[PDB]
From a paper:
CA forms the capsid shell surrounding the viral core that protects and transports the viral genome and also interacts with host cell factors that are necessary for trafficking, nuclear entry and proviral integration. Further, we assemble particles from [name] CArec in vitro and use single-particle cryogenic electron microscopy (cryo-EM) to determine the high-resolution structures of four different types of Fullerene shell assemblies. Our studies of [name] CArec show that an ERV retains the ability to form capsid assemblies using the same architecture as exogenous viruses. Analysis of the shell structures reveals the intra- and inter-molecular interactions that drives CA assembly into pentamers and hexamers and their association into shells that encapsidate the retroviral genome.
To guide the structural interpretation of these particles at higher resolution, we determined the 1.8 Å crystal structure of the CArec N-terminal domain (CArec-[name]) and the solution NMR structure of CArec C-terminal domain (CArec-CTD). CArec-[name] has the same N-terminal β-hairpin and six-helix fold observed in exogenous orthoretroviral CA proteins. Structural superimposition with exogenous retroviral CA domains revealed the strongest similarity of CArec-[name] with the CA-[name] of the beta and alpharetroviruses Jaagsiekte sheep retrovirus (JSRV) and Rous sarcoma virus (RSV) (Z-scores 10.7 and 9.0) and the most distant relationship to the CA-[name] of the gammaretrovirus MLV. Importantly, although α11 displays the sequential and medium-range inter-residue nuclear Overhauser effect (NOE) cross-peaks that define a helical conformation, the higher T2, lower T1 and lower heteronuclear 1H-15N NOE values observed in NMR relaxation experiments together indicate it is more dynamic than the core domain (α7–α10). These high-resolution structures could be docked directly into the cryo-EM density and, with the additional building of the [name]–CTD linkers, the [name]–CTD interface and helix α8 at the CTD–CTD interface, refined well into each particle structure. Exceptions were the N-terminal β-hairpin that contains a large loop insertion and is more mobile than in the crystal structure, and the [name]–CTD linker region of D5 and D6 equatorial hexamers that displayed weaker density.
Author numbering:
A (entry chain B): 1 to 5, 21 to 149
B (entry chain A): 1 to 6, 23 to 151
Amino acid sequence: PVTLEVEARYKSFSIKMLKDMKEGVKQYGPNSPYMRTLLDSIAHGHRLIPYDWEILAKSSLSPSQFLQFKTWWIDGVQEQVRRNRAANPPVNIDADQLLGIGQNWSTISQQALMQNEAIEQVRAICLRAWEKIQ
Amino acid sequence: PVTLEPARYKSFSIKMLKDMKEGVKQYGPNSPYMRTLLDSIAHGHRLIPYDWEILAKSSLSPSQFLQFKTWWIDGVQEQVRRNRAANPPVNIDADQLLGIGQNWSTISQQALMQNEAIEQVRAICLRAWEKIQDP
C-alpha cells in the first residue's frame, strides 16, 4: 500500500498477512464470507496501487484462480476505459495506469503518484475481478 | 485502524463489524475460522487499542467481552513485567498497551504509537481472544 505523508511512500504487505490469506483462500475459497470480509477491509482500509493488487492476487490465489482474476481485471479495465472516454469531460486514465504497466506506470514510484480517481477505479475493478473468480 | 504510521485513523466499516459479529455467532470466537480471520486483520492493518476495543465489543457477547478484557489486562500486566526486566528496558507501559489514562485514552494519542507497541498490543490481544470461553 501507499501512504501519503505530500510525499508518497510504498510499504509492502505483511508476510504473515499474505500467509494468512493464502491459507484462508485454500481452506474457505476466494469468495467465501471469510475472504470477502478480509479483502474488503484491506482494499478500503488502504490506498492500493495495481502492484499491491498483483501481489495480493498472485500470492493468495491458486494458479487457475489467478488466471481468472487477471482476465476479469482486464475485462473491468476495458469497461472502465470506455466510460472514461465517454465521460464529459473525458477522464484521462487509460489501461496502462489501471494495469500498472508501460513507460509511465510500470514502477511502484510512478504508481504511488496515482490520483484519487485512479485509485478508486483500480479498487472497484480489482474487487469485481476477485468476486468473479469461479 | 491507523492509516498513517507515526498520523490518522479510519474506523472499520459498519459492514465489516457486522460480518465479524455474524462470524462469532455462527462459529464462535475461537474457531480456527475466527482465529485466522482475526490474525489476518491484525497483520493486515495497524491496530491501536481503540480498534481492539471496538472489534471485541462489537463481535462478542457481554460475557465473552468481559473475558477478553480481563485477559487483555492480564497479558498487559505480564508484558509490563517483561518490559521492565528487559535489557535494556522497553519503555512501554500498561496505559499505552490498553489505550487508557492521560497519555493514551484518545485515538489521536494512540495513532502515534510506534511499531514495538503496536506489535505488543497485537500479541496480547490475540492471546486474550484465544482465552475466551464458549457458552
